[PDB]
Ligand code: CLA
Ligand code: CLA
Ligand code: CLA
């Protein structure tokens with residue numbers, strides 16, 4: 001599994017604990033888990049940075065008298081969302097993952113959907129890169145940006161739970 | 172050499188250095204012209220980085236002083 | 245194990261009610277004997293000092309430190325009270341000489357008692373005049389056994405003195421001070 | 422080595438591997454050897470910590486003077502929680518310097534425990550063989566050769582006892598600190614902890 | 615030469631080479647010759663210094679006058695430390711001139727103690743064979759042939775005694791100076807040291 | 808052939824196995840441009856100057872001071888010695904050694920085919936020996952002393968303080984010295 005995607009940077013194939021050398025047949029599940037984590041992390045990092053200088057106009061509920069511009073930046077912004085809005089967000093995520101972008105087949109654990117690639121959701125109406133060098137570069141860029149976004153989103157979460165902002169002190 | 176606590180001064184000079192290095196040209200060879208990194212390392216060596224950072228520092232000094240005279244930094 | 249130390253008053257056998265052997269090797273038994281012998285000799289010196297000073301004794305004639313105001317007779321007759329009246333320079337001198345002697349005892353015996361050797365045979369500080377330079381090997385074992393027995397009795401003696409000083413009316417022959 | 426041929430097992434969890442998270446079979450042998458070394462170091466540190474915390478909570482201080490002007494009982498007047506901070510700075514410096522030297526010396530030894538050594542077998546003389554550094558041959562583990570009268574089977578049984586006691590000691594020292602921090606968490610630990 | 619075939623050894627450090635830092639193993643033979651020459655010169659200087667410091671501490675002075683107007687007892691009216699500053703500068707310059715001549719003529723001899731000579735074996739007549747300079751044939755070491763009645767074994771034993779006394783004398787003179795400069799460090803110096 | 812230090816950069820072709828201190832660490836490929844004996848000359852001169860500078864800085868800061876010198880810290884020692892007027896006198900041994908040794912040695916490194924290597928002044932008065940193990944020790948201590956003097960000067964200018972050159976002394980070096988109660992509060 002040393003020649004697969006993600007083993008491109010200065011470290012080559014970097015598996016210290018050896019998850020995929022102990023179980024080489026478990027690489028596809030780990031790749032799907034990493035790809036979902038990376039995509040959620042890119043969305044989270046972009047939301048963290050963009051909510052600081054961009055805010056929607058108008059109200060959020062028009063019943064709890066809560067504005068888009070009144071939610072501060074972060075965890076407290078998710079606090080001030082009304083319970084119906086939280087229910088709708090969870091319904092959107094559940095419908096988005098259980099049926100539309102389905103990362104897992106199988107009864108309980110979820111292997112990989114058929115003979116597709118790990119993280120090969122959406123389908124049909126999605127850009128399919130030909131020219132395998134370009135496809136390999138695009139996929140490796142996706143994976144590496146996902147990993148960097150995981151670390152960044154974790155750091156901003158660590159900052160937000162001990163401050164009022166995700167910006168570290170001194171910045 | 173570094174600015175006195177100014178992060179905006181750091182961004183102008185670093186961006187000028189990166190822009191100059193990507194937009195250099197020696198003997199028709201250039202990163203922007205579609206000419207690969209490894210052989211430009213092979214053909215020029217440290218002369219590439221030295222010339223690029225010298226011109227980038229000149230350009231960054233001009234841009235920093237202009238934006239200081241106008242108002243920003 | 246077999247070693248020295250045993251004899252009469254126990255039946256010619258080793259004394260250990262609580263086990264404290266059968267978890268000990270040759271190195272550990274050598275450490276046991278070295279610690280026993282050092283404690284024994286220190287305790288014999290300690291009883292010979294406390295008994296001489298507290299009971300009677302002419303005490304050392306002289307002054308003890310010409311500058312500070314102390315006299316040999318001004319130290320007193322109590323054991324612990326006179327030790328505190330010894331000056332700090334004298335205490336540090338005694339402790340430093342003892343430490344130098346034992347560090348050289350550790351670094352001077354090349355078959356170390358924990359790596360061979362004989363436990364309790366420290367270099368120097370024994371007979372400078374060679375009183376036991378002609379004794380037979382059979383007689384020397386008797387003297388070593390006598391040293392061990394007198395040392396154990398002296399260990400009990402020093403702890404009796406310490407108990408009588410700290411908690412009064414313990415050790416009934418020893419008085420309240 | 423593999424987690425199957427390892428001295429953890431124990432008779433309490435049915436005589437098999439307790440691992441309910443599947444960690445032992447999800448990683449390679451090098452990670453398992455690192456985990457065994459970390460568990461053993463944790464257990465020994467926790468045994469020392471539990472005994473020291475019990476002693477400091479019973480207010481059993483040394484007779485004498487810690488620093489000139491600072492009594493052992495003066496530091497141990499409060500509980501073990503407010504005790505390490507009452508130590509003078511030089512003493513904490515010397516303790517942590519000795520621990521630093523021990524860790525560096527035991528890690529810089531021939532066959533590392535992840536590269537051919539035995540995880541948890543600390544070398545007897547960590548400060549021996551270092552150029553320009555001389556130390557006495559006091560052994561780090563067993564300065565007195567207590568485990569020289571022990572056979573291989575007795576050594577294995579006492580290694581099993583060491584592992585079980587280290588696990589219990591980790592639970593106990595975390596129990597002590599949590600019982601001080603969160604009163605009423607541990608019912609036995611009353612006030613002075 | 616080699617540090618193995620040298621005369622230090624001694625029964626105090628068991629009977630082997632004492633060197634705990636491995637100085638003699640990292641350096642070549644020439645540095646060992648320099649170390650032995652420096653050790654022996656240090657020991658002889660320290661022996662003379664210890665004897666002179668004890669004589670000055672006992673307030674023992676020559677019957678007479680050091681400089682015209684300055685009695686020996688006038689200089690020795692204080693401790694040995696505040697006696698060197700009471701000697702006139704001319705006398706100390708003459709002492710240092712004789713010492714400079716002795717050091718220069720000692721090192722000017724042939725087979726230097728690195729380049730073939732024996733380290734610490736200062737030859738009998740350092741001021742002999744020098745053009746433009748004349749001196750009587752008073753020997754530097756043993757002007758009286760005291761070590762001519764001795765055999766080889768007695769000479770080796772007394773060389774070992776010299777080395778041991780030199781090491782003890784260095785410890786002693788450093789103790790004297792440190793006790794004067796920092797009182798209370800060496801408890802063996804009452805006031806006049 | 809990848810470099811030993813950087814496992815993803817290629818090995819520099821001018822550093823094979825000799826010239827003690829060779830860790831295979833040469834990005835920028837400066838060995839191709841700068842001649843390698845000249846670079847060793849510069850490295851070992853910097854190393855020796857930095858070793859002496861570190862020891863002098865720490866020794867003056869700890870309190871050791873020769874007679875009639877200004878009793879100041881090593882941060883203000885330069886200005887104090889210049890104001891006293893004797894710090895110019897240090898230049899004469901430096902001028903002697905540096906001119907009459909370095910200038911012919913640099914010229915012979917650049918010109919002469921057979922010449923002594925960079926740090927090889929053939930000084931060795933005692934005769935310790937210039938073994939390959941000793942050269943590695945020299946260059947390791949020199950690189951350490953270079954980084955050390957850089958850190959010491961930069962921290963001593965920031966704090967204007969005592970020997971540890973941190974904002975709170977050795978307590979910044981050892982976090983267990985500083986209020987372990989907060990660490991215990993999360994256990
Ligand atoms: C951090 C300390 C530590 C470490 C490194 C280990 C490591 C190990 N244990 Mg172990 N153990 C510990 C603490 C630890 N244990 C404690 C405290 C107990 C008592 C409950 C046990 C009880 C125990 C049993 C009964 C067995 C093992 C076994 C093993 C080995 C195989 C399991 C494995 O791969 O997990 C790798 C482990 C880790 C990577 C550590 C993960 C630590 C997580 C992050 C902490 C989660 C704790 C959580 C907060 C709950 C704490 C509450 C608690 C205080 C009550 C492995 C060498 C098995 C064995 O030896 O078989 C050969 C076995 O049968 N352990
Ligand atoms: C400066 C004085 C000096 C010098 C040059 C030497 C030199 C030598 N000694 Mg020696 N020695 C000295 C003082 C000195 N000694 C003293 C004072 C003692 C008494 C403790 C001894 C006790 C001693 C023993 C027992 C033996 C030697 C041996 C040797 C030889 C081999 C060891 C070696 O390579 O070390 C080279 C030494 C140095 C380069 C000196 C480094 C000193 C450092 C820089 C300073 C450290 C001092 C330290 C802070 C303590 C100062 C306080 C003090 C007052 C306690 C060598 C010729 C061995 C020998 O002869 O075997 C053949 C041997 O067995 N020495
Ligand atoms: C490190 C060596 C050393 C140093 C620096 C000093 C320094 C000093 N000594 Mg001193 N001294 C020393 C060793 C030393 N001593 C020794 C070893 C002895 C015992 C013999 C003495 C006995 C001594 C006396 C009795 C007096 C001094 C005095 C003095 C002070 C004045 C200088 C003077 O008159 O010198 C005199 C120094 C000597 C006579 C020592 C000579 C040392 C050489 C090397 C020995 C020669 C060998 C041989 C045995 C000498 C006799 C040979 C002859 C019979 C043929 C000065 C502070 C005087 C004083 O108190 O202040 C005025 C004073 O009255 N010293």
Ligand code: CLA
Pocket residue numbers: 745746747
């Ligand atoms: C006024 C200054 C002066 C003069 C005129 C000389 C003259 C001489 N030196 Mg000279 N020297 C001087 C200062 C001087 N030096 C200084 C300051 C030093 C440094 C310490 C030296 C170090 C030096 C060395 C190292 C050597 C000379 C040698 C020589 C001689 C060269 C050839 C020769 O005749 O050899 C034949 C030698 C002689 C004929 C020797 C006879 C000289 C005696 C000592 C004259 C007696 C003078 C008398 C004591 C009055 C002087 C009083 C004074 C001490 C206050 C020559 C006579 C060389 C030589 O061979 O001389 C030994 C030699 O090797 N010198």
Ligand code: CLA
Pocket residue numbers: 856857858859860862863864866867871872873876877878879880881884885888893894895896897899900
């Ligand atoms: C990188 C090396 C380096 C540098 C740049 C300095 C720099 C400094 N040190 Mg320093 N030091 C160093 C290493 C260094 N140190 C080391 C390694 C040590 C430990 C051994 C020390 C120990 C030290 C102490 C203990 C002291 C300094 C002091 C000083 C300061 C004043 C020095 C001065 O005035 O010199 C003046 C130079 C001289 C007087 C000698 C010049 C030589 C004369 C001109 C003759 C030239 C020779 C001639 C041609 C031939 C001989 C002639 C004659 C014999 C006939 C200055 C900031 C002093 C200070 O002020 O600190 C607060 C001070 O007290 N340092």
Ligand SMILES: CCCCCC(=O)OC\C(C=C=C1C(C)(C)C[C@H](OC(C)=O)C[C@@]1(C)O)=C/C=C/C(C)=C/C=C/C=C(C)/C=C/C=C(\C)C(=O)C[C@@]12O[C@]1(C)C[C@@H](O)CC2(C)C
Pocket residue numbers: 041042043045046125126127145146148149151152153155156167168171
């Ligand atoms: C219709 C919905 C489409 C959704 C998908 C989408 O929109 O994807 C768009 C997309 C590409 C694409 C496309 C496809 C996806 C291929 C297909 C699409 O076409 C269709 C519909 O098929 C269009 C197309 C071509 O565009 C790519 C999006 C990529 C994205 C959004 C990548 C975020 C990285 C963030 C990082 C690396 C953060 C690092 C954070 C780091 C490194 C930190 O440490 C943070 C830091 O704070 C810390 C902790 C402390 C601070 O002091 C300092 C900073 C601030 C540094």
Ligand SMILES: CC(=O)O[C@H]1CC(C)(C)C(=C=C/C(C)=C/C=C/C(C)=C/C=C/C=C(C)/C=C/C=C(\C)C(=O)C[C@@]23O[C@]2(C)C[C@@H](O)CC3(C)C)[C@](C)(O)C1
Pocket residue numbers: 429430431432433434439584585586588589592
């Ligand atoms: C085979 C082998 O060699 O191993 C050996 C080693 C060893 C150790 C001796 C063994 C053992 C046995 C022992 C002694 C095991 C000890 C176990 C022990 C003593 C475990 C304490 C748990 C305390 C907890 C979980 C506290 C929770 C606390 C929680 C969850 C809370 O925060 C409470 C709360 O959250 C709720 C619940 C709801 C929230 O709304 C409100 C809050 C937040 C307040 C073995 C395994 O038998 C054999």
Ligand SMILES: CC(=O)O[C@H]1CC(C)(C)C(=C=C/C(C)=C/C=C/C(C)=C/C=C/C=C(C)/C=C/C=C(\C)C(=O)C[C@@]23O[C@]2(C)C[C@@H](O)CC3(C)C)[C@](C)(O)C1
Pocket residue numbers: 344348622623624625626627777778781782785
């Ligand atoms: C043949 C053979 O075997 O040779 C023999 C030779 C010989 C002589 C017979 C032998 C012997 C026996 C003897 C008598 C050995 C004696 C050894 C002895 C007596 C050794 C004293 C050390 C005192 C020290 C280090 C003081 C430190 C002082 C220190 C560290 C300080 O306080 C300095 C400091 O306060 C300052 C100044 C200010 C600040 O900076 C802070 C600090 C706190 C750091 C041997 C060993 O058997 C070997």
